[PDB]
Design a protein around this ligand. Structure first.
Ligand SMILES: [Mg+2]
Lengths: 162, 162, 162
């Protein structure tokens, strides 16, 4: 009775819960783009890894339509999480604070049917709100285009525990 | 308890993990300085800091600077600007003042002379912390003639000394 | 008490093993590229950091030969790890599962001796098998080239504890 997760009984002694150390799950769900009046969505099947106090969302490559210079990519965790994971388990340790967390470069191929031109855009975790994770995608300039080829992207942040 | 050692701690009467170890948020409002090949400038930024388990994350926002070299150093002066009770020493890496190539990543920097930026794909990493100044190396990707630089948001992470 | 790593005796109390919190080592070893009939290898000296349930492999910049549009970059951990680290210490928590983990942008300079053109490629941890870590490198298009200039790249993933 004397132990509190992530401290746990490990082979009759005091150890660290294996579940805290590593948990794998999956999100089959919708990624939505919105920017300067452009809107579209695509389905992705993504692995999720939860390791110590961090969650990692491993988005695969996907194809979308036009994007703006700056815009938002939103992951809807309200549906699609593999049980027993719940929407609440994707809440950041900074809750619904607005942040600039895990900012990275992502190269997106812009085209209108032909050979894509790759733009180096800037992506970060901005805000989680009621199960929707909003990622800012901006910078790198733009070209006229009708289609976007997105790379595989890993999105990571510290996960709520209270 | 006298018989527990941080980060192990009393958590609602039992043996648990200190919440402060699991998540601690702070802020740095301070000076980022660029130096390369005789070029020198500085800019003030507001940045969230998140300490999670044995890692520190410094979430730099987008900022604008002046000319950069093919290779150069970006320095974050943590001697001042940290929100109390966080102290300069709390930013020291677990590798102390070793010279490293840690967390190497792509950073796209927009170079211009006032007009539309050309983005160069540069290579950034944590190289050395010394006396409260974190030095990041920024090199590669080639260059153009320019007088202004548009820097992306960049998250700087590394293992924190204990 | 009966303590189970990473829970350990510290200073007479129940604490967290310093070994679990931070360990620094090195891999001096052979990185091999394979793609579309192209094959070559390079030697690298890389720092390794193990921090909580993560390993970080800090590859330095290196020069290679021709790459394909898509290919594998493989790290041979069977030899080259600094004692007391062993090959098994590099096994992922997802063991030998095929994954798309830690996907990121990497800019590689392609040339035939002259001025490099930088391609934004997409790199991820794909599979560890019998001491060999296989990273996928694809996307971003290509040009005709005989030489590749690779940036410093840090690759990280959760490490097995079983
Ligand atoms: Mg293959």
């Amino acid at each position: 009775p004397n132990l509190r997760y992530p401290i746990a009984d490990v082979s009759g002694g005091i150890g660290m819960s294996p579940n805290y150390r590593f948990r794998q799950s999956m999100w089959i769900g919708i990624v939505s783009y919105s920017g300067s009046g452009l809107n579209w969505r695509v389905q992705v099947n993504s692995d999720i890894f939860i390791v110590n106090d961090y969650i990692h969302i491993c988005l695969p490559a996907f194809d979308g339509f036009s994007i703006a210079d700056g815009g938002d990519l939103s992951l809807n965790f309200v549906t699609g999480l593999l049980p027993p994971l719940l929407t609440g388990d994707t809440e950041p340790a900074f809750h619904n604070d607005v942040v600039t967390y895990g900012a990275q470069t992502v190269a997106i191929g812009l085209s209108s049917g032909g050979t894509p031109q790759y733009m180096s855009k800037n992506l970060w975790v901005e805000q989680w709100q009621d199960g929707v994770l909003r990622l800012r995608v901006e910078g790198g300039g733009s070209i006229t285009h009708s289609n976007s080829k997105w790379p595989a992207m890993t999105v990571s942040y510290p996960r709520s525990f209270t």
